[PDB]
Amino acid sequence: DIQMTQSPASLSASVGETVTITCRASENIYSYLAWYQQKQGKSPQLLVYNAKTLAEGVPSRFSGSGSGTQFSLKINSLQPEDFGSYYCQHHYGTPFTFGSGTKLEI
Amino acid sequence: DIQMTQSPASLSASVGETVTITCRASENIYSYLAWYQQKQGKSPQLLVYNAKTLAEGVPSRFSGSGSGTQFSLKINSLQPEDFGSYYCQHHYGTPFTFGSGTKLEI
């Protein structure tokens, strides 16, 4: 029973810029934290897991960092395709739950 | 003649959370970068200068970091009074100019 707190709720940027999304956990979870991307109306795609490990075929502009209770996903040079929703999910103590989410838009 | 690029344009969060604002410079400026806060309809107040030095009577939840061309102002546990506009300004080569700004709102 862990509480995930993501922020900001939504942010507005322009192509080429850099943005930072963060997630705080109510308890310590070490590095069992993953980030998902969800655009259009599709299932969430896995971007990074284990706090900072990219997933197969995931652009290098995506980088996660953090350990314990503070984690953050940073996006470099926003590409137009990166606009959508981002969710963090702890992969620690079941059941696994997500953060409120962050809507990213131009 | 230096170009400052701030981002995001605006972000939405809730009291208690943590947000990160960034500013990129077109050239290297070392640590000659300051952040200003502007709320309501008042003049910009100085938060941090020289990249990471707080100003007199500036809450500890405000922390700047960065050097060269990448700098960022991080705000911990947003207090309700922290909502307004934030501007970065390089204090390097005249004339001194600001970034596009970031509107922070609940």
From Swiss-Prot, chains A, B:
Example GO BP: adaptive immune response
A GO CC term assigned to this protein in UniProt: immunoglobulin complex
Gene Ontology MF annotations: antigen binding
Region annotation Framework-1: where it falls in the sequence: 1-23
Localization, UniProt: Secreted; Cell membrane
Disulfide bonds: 23-88
Keywords: Adaptive immunity, Cell membrane, Disulfide bond, Immunity, Immunoglobulin, Immunoglobulin domain, Membrane, Secreted, Signal
Protein's UniProt name: Immunoglobulin kappa variable 1-39
Native source organism of the sequence: Homo sapiens (Human)
Gene: IGKV1-39
Full-sequence portion shown in this chain: 23 to 117 of 117
